[PDB]
Design a protein around this ligand. Structure first.
Ligand SMILES: [Br-]
Ligand SMILES: [Br-]
Ligand SMILES: [Br-]
Ligand SMILES: [Br-]
Lengths: 206, 209
């Protein structure tokens, strides 16, 4: 495993689309008995980094391989993806032939879902204009009026109520997402167990 | 990857501490005849992703390996890293650099920002700190700093409004200010017509970013 070891350091590897939105909440509401080392990763890197010992815990989404036996998990929260765009009416329409699309990477948990829904809807012709795994990068480019992006509710909650971003669909084009915290089912240090035990108690407040 | 291709796609790999602040102004000012594919990387991945067909351009800082042939470069902008922290509700810093083992919010050891900060901290033996939060995402250290968790060295372009608002307070404006310089790197060989257009077009914006 990793030779890097302290008694209080919590080594976390979080998905690109999840780090900025979730980790500030955890670090703030956790008992200050920990030291944090955060590494932004893709979803497909999480399995090896847990088995190799690179990370004590993983903050990503629904992973088919991580839900199973050698790993334990907590569902941190579930959210919904809403296709939004900038300016009190949408700057773009979904029925517009080949609209500018702001999407996540193909190898992200979240780009795969949007790519599946778009292919499932033949009535939506689009032109991919910007691709990034950072939810904030896609958010800022969307607020600049560059196109349409599927974004999570928590990351654009203030902009939807503000009017800077406008939701385009609430029924058939809403994609569900579930965020999870993963770990090896084996016993860890006493502080890592304290981190895991506390993390469960903060879940209802997440 | 090397096989993925469209007519207008421009594959970009930007450093973790630079991708979010640099990409929006580039997309907004570049003539929108381009398709963007951006992925955040660590500084040490730039050479291999350029030699292979993984990235057309790299958005990083001063890296000596990338400042020689077979690479061409272009200067984008320079900035400064200020040690900042949240306020204590009275317009004064919640922490001070003189605190024995003050909470430090630092970049990762593998980042170019982390090495510059660690060197600055090593040069000043009068500062005792305790590493509390580590991440090479500038805006993650930024919000953790705004929540009042410790002191972080952050670039001026990412905390400009927070300095004005007072949510963040600069702790040193002299010896602890670290100069940084962003670059855009590329292979010296001839690229596609669309890629060469991107390179020249970005060159015309290197003083307006
Ligand atoms: Br994702
Ligand atoms: Br404990
Ligand atoms: Br230059
Ligand atoms: Br860096």
């Amino acid at each position: 495993g990793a030779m890097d070891y302290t008694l209080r350091k919590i080594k976390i590897a979080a998905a690109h689309s999840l780090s900025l939105g979730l980790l500030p909440t955890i670090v703030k509401q956790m008992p200050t008995q920990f030291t944090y080392a955060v590494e932004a990763i893709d979803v497909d890197q999480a399995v090896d980094m847990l088995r190799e010992g690179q990370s004590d815990f993983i903050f990503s989404y629904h992973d088919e391989n991580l839900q199973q036996a050698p790993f334990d998990n907590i569902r941190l929260f579930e959210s919904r993806l809403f296709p939004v765009c900038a300016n009190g009416e949408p700057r773009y329409t979904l029925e517009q032939p080949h609209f500018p699309l702001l999407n996540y990477s193909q190898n992200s948990y979240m780009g795969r879902l949007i790519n599946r829904t778009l292919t499932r809807h033949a009535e939506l012709s689009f032109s991919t204009f910007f691709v990034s795994s950072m939810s904030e990068l896609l958010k800022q480019v969307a607020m600049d009026g560059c196109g349409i992006a599927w974004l999570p509710e928590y990351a654009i909650r203030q902009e939807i109520t503000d009017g800077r971003l406008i939701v385009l669909d609430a029924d058939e084009l809403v994609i569900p997402i579930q965020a999870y915290a993963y770990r090896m089912n084996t016993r860890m240090s006493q502080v890592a167990e304290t981190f895991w035990r506390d993390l469960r108690g903060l879940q209802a407040a997440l």
